[PDB]
Design a protein around this ligand. Structure first.
Ligand SMILES: [Mg+2]
Ligand SMILES: [Mg+2]
Ligand SMILES: [Mg+2]
Ligand SMILES: [Mg+2]
Lengths: 211, 211, 211, 211
């Protein structure tokens, strides 16, 4: 819709802050000081990888006019077996993963991506984030089923105590099992829109976590 | 009105900028390099002085339930003859005035305050801003008359080429005479509300000018 | 080292957030649901009153070249017996005090201002913040002079459970006695500089609390 | 020197604005009212396409330990003949190109990418940006190799009046030939780092242009 040519602003607006519990990686690490090794988990897409390139390619290739590609097995086979070569790792994830390896934590990736016959995503993550064998676990492809949070049972089964993610379902999955859900900002150039309201559950949101 | 307990945010919103032509004092000075002395002008209230203390006192004393104090001669006599001892000079004004003195410009103050029998505001300004006799001019008390911009004729008469102010009428007074109107941000703790939309005429707005 | 004429910016900087635990008045109220009436406390200067007008006048009048006015009984007698008529109440304080009065909480003000023979600050506060007799308490002048008690000691004595303040010492006083210290932003046009780093101890900071 | 665990902030910092000449697409369009059809130009990378996915893949694949991939013809052949299928078009570019097409302007793309035997980038751009045949022009590969012309020379040759770009060199190329250089923000998740200082030459910078 049209809007004023010169909208202007004012210093109340310029200074205005949403009441969000922002945290840093250093603050998270400090909050865990002395805690022995435990399981933690990460969403993948827009949490540790900017994977829009593959999802964008998939949409254009398989369903230019809809979201049907996301239920298309042919898309998932491409997405999970090499299109992540184009996925850009997020610095926030490098920092979190390093921190959790430092702690001796077991690292899980729990994604709403659909399972495929083979997958190279686990290797991509281990390689890009320099995750040792002992801390690494194969990616859990939990899928996406409207009406159910497919991640919650996985967080319970793996006794995941902190779950990082960009989407509301990541935070509520953590809430479902009494884990600590921590929000990462989805980048504004992500093709997955609209952007979620980070902090909408009163959860911690990591500063500067869009890259 | 009520609003969500946890509203959240997103990185598009966090990065979002209004299309405003922000400038610095240094940029203004540079834009004038080589220009010989000329007349420039300043609004007073929320431009060079945070004078809300006196206006706040005036409202409480003379019309706690209305804006009638602003048409009350007894208020103006107090406001213009000592209540500016409580008015806090703005750093942006110190910087602009110093810059204009450096240039050899003639400095005018054009205020919508009502004229009084005597006034000590001119002395307050000369003293607080260290304005030499040659650059200083007595404050012009132009008053406030709905339906008229009382400042425009003054800017014309004094051949003022740049006019600084926080209010829309300051900018449009400059526009009226073809002067360069430059916006200063009104502080968010000013008692003069609502805050104006700085930049709403496509004018330059000085960064960080709320203090 | 250069402060370039055209410094530019980038979107990392534009979106950058300090890791602050921001909260709203509504969130604080929510945290207190079902809690019986209790004592709460406020610092005065830059917490509930923008009192810089009086402090500015005091400095110019009594020690233009130093900070000695703050040790000058002549200044304090003026500051505590009427110059607060020029102090601007903060909206954040209106909201907090209203919320606490509604809870049936006792309202205390604990200030580091030097004590005087008489003071009219208590009345100024009760009048401006519409504090009912049953919730109102005379201002406490805390400090390190003989016969005085510290802010910490007074918080302990009055069983103050939450203490609101803009300075580091307000937060540490609360924490020394196991009270909840909550930070209010000092306005950028305050004459008390430098501005504190709100959130420096990981405490809650109230959003938009500069006005 | 310390990066404190709890750094805090203050309202001067929160409200702080860089002195940038921000503009909107609507403001640019307004500035062109009544101007006949003309040639305009765009840089490609981080201006119209977030092409970091291909550049990221290229670096990992061809020079994981250096920047040598950018001198590797094998990389450029991949980058210019299909890896842009994974590049994410920028909304700011959709708006600008739409606006310019509506004006009947000629659309040029002038890139510093190394030239290849064949390229499919022109088609990618025409398809994604819905650029009609009459407005579309094949991508120009500019540079300093033998037989090439510089960006400046091409802007001169094609009578390009406005040039959009994210890098300093895009702005200076425009200015060297008297064209209007307008800056687009590079996304913070770009792999081309450090981010430029948008506005470093006092040029117009498009608001919200990181996506
Ligand atoms: Mg995700
Ligand atoms: Mg004014
Ligand atoms: Mg205080
Ligand atoms: Mg570029």
């Amino acid at each position: 819709s049209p809007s004023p040519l010169n909208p202007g602003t004012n210093v109340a607006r310029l200074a205005e802050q949403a009441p969000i519990h922002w945290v840093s990686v250093a603050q998270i690490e400090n909050s865990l000081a002395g805690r022995p090794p435990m399981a933690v988990g990460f969403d993948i897409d827009d949490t540790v990888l900017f994977s829009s390139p593959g999802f964008w390619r998939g949409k254009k290739t398989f369903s230019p006019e809809s979201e049907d590609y996301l239920k298309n097995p042919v898309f998932w086979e491409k997405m999970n077996n090499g299109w992540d070569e184009f996925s850009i790792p997020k610095e926030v994830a490098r920092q979190l993963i390093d921190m959790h390896v430092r702690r001796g934590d077991a690292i899980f990736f729990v994604t709403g991506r659909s399972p495929t016959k083979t997958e190279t995503v686990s290797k991509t993550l281990a390689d890009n984030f320099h995750i040792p064998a002992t801390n690494m676990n194969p990616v859990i492809f939990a899928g996406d089923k409207p009406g159910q949070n497919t991640k919650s049972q996985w967080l319970q089964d793996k006794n995941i105590r902190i779950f990082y993610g960009d989407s509301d379902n990541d935070i509520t999955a953590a809430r479902d099992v009494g884990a600590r859900g921590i929000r990462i900002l989805r980048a504004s150039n992500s093709t997955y829109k609209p952007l979620p309201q980070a902090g909408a559950f009163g959860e911690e949101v990591i500063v500067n976590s869009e890259y």
